[PDB]
Amino acid sequence: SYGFQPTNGVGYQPYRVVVLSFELLHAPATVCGPKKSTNLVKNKCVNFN
Amino acid sequence: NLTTRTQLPPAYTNSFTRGVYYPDKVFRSSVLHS
């Protein structure tokens, strides 16, 4: 058990940790960043994302 | 309960060229990949 007391020092205080794990270069992605979506063009040298 | 359905020693079979899966989800055409 953990004795998390308000009088304890920083070393013995509660600390909440969230570890986010994601894998790139994989199957079709589902969770994506908040970016827009420009229309699609063809037969024209263009940058793509 | 349902123990001892029957009594027989297991047999063995040649798997041949079986059990090969796709290593990754990347399309590859007309290539040899190690």
Ligand SMILES: *[C@@H]1O[C@H](CO)[C@@H](O)[C@H](O)[C@H]1NC(C)=O
């Ligand atoms: C045989 O009977 C029960 C019936 O519910 C079964 O689920 C269970 O696997 C067996 N019980 C034993 C082996 O004690």
